[PDB]
């Protein structure tokens, strides 16, 4: 019953600073310490430091030490975390997530930042120099055939990419994006289908990128 | 000479957590007149009774005192494992003790009230690795480590207390917490005895 | 910092069967203060495992954890379809906390070679000045392929991108696609595009080319 809901998704420049929080609901803060987590693309797990709620007093990783505040606001039982400047290998999800709740010590002392039963949703945080951008799609164009939109180009993430308004989904696979040199992201969408089928049925990619409001519907036939 | 309870009946009987603590040696008591001056709603004792309390010759006898809300009742007890046993006011197990709840009558002039009834509801450190939280619980026949830092009526229900030891006083960080009750119309006490058999001077008149 | 390090890096295995996960710390872990957690595609970490061996609430028999000091295990008795996942370890018995690399628990399924597909860049991208070259692996196992660029017989370094997809929840297969980005003018100077795939289900390199212009 217990949930952590953070704040939305955020894009930064180098340099500047971001603040997101976490607000705790379905139960009381019951003085379970509020850790701070993130996760690079691709990669693992980072402890960045957390805050006791009964104290006020919060604790950071070395290597955030100077960079990262963690506070705390009992009366909207809310959680914060402003890590500042902020760089490229910055860009990852930030989790914030409780303590598992044990017996009070009054054991004869407690152990705070433990093993972390409650997890929010993560909150995406992008730190780049590219301004937003919609993508441009591409036709990739087709025993089996394969067919699909190359959409390349945009900023940030995430696009969404459909076939036929949905009805398309059995062979489909969209790739994950990747980050080019460019710093703008691309990604592909590819779909199997039966070669005698290139003459009568319509494939179209149907490509959604919200923070630029770009929605393209892209045929995709034979060259 | 007469053991002299008289400093209790005059001023506002500070909260428990700053329990006013008399001590007797080599005198002579009456408390079923010190009892007389107050209408008693609860008198319970642990290794003696009411009836022997005030009839046996002690080496000592330690009486503290506080205002303490009848309401709170279940929290002022030998059994007791709630916050006013765990941070403010703890009896020693080893000695015969009473417990007693009272209040002042409109008889009783002298007694002051305070504006409301107020506790430590949570003493605890934060040792110097910013992680390790030691609760502060009281020992008997002593106040806790908060006291300093916590005001001698706490303002509003909830309020914070918060010091940074020095590395001197073993750094990190003592925080207390407060819990009011609204006063009531007439004043209501708690009171503590404690004995010890020795020789034994403290003898009822 | 407390190091660590979990092995294997990934378990190929089918539902049913007893998988066994180990993490290695760099120094003794106080008080056993070793976590175990969960991790899907786009979700939070789900705790399994605290104190090195304390189920956590909710949390199926089949987990169970063990270990001290520097050796940590993880066993699940019998995997269901839904403990395909990723796997951490976390000790809290020092600061900062630290987290180990994770292990993947996979479906293990027959090997399936790639079928092999290339795509040309569009006439519309080509003349708006840029060559997006996509060579697509489709539904094969295991994970582990090589996909090599030529272009006329020239191997490409430094100008191509792959991206791959999780496993399929219903072939238990990997797809995988690798992008190779010229300009316009270098493009040009070329006419043979292709993409040459190793994979343990291929005999040999299976080689899917075009020939710009045609
Ligand atoms: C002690 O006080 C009680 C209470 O009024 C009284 O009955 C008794 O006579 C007193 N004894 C002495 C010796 O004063
Ligand atoms: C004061 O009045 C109270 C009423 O509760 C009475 O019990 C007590 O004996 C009186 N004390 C005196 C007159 O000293």
Redesign the interface.
Known sequence: QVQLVQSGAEVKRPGSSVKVSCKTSGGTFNNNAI?WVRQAPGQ????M?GI?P??????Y???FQGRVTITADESTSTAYMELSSLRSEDTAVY?C?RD?PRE???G??????????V????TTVTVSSASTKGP?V????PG?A?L?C?V?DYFPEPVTVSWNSGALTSGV?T????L?SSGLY???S?V?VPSSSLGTQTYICNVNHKPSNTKVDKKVEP? | VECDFSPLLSGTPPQVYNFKRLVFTNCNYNLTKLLSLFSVNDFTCSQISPAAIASNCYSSLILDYFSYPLSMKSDLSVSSAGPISQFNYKQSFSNPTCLILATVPHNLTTITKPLKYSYINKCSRLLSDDRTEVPQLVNANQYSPCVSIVPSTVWEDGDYYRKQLSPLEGGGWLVASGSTVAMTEQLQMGFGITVQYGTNSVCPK | EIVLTQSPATLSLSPGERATLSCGASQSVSSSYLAWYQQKPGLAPRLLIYDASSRATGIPDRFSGSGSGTDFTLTISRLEPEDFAVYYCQQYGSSPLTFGGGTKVEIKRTVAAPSVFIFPPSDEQLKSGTASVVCLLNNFYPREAKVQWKVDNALQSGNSQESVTEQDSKDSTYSLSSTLTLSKADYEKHKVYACEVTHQGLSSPVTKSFNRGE
């Open positions: 850790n693992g797990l980072e402890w430091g006791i009964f104290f006020g007093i919060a604790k990783a070395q290597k989790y997530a598992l009070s010590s009054y004869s002392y407690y152990t705070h930042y433990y093993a972390m039963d997890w929010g949703q993560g441009s591409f036709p990739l164009a089996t394969a699909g190359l390349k696979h790739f994950p994006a990747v080019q691309s990604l592909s590819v199997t060259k």
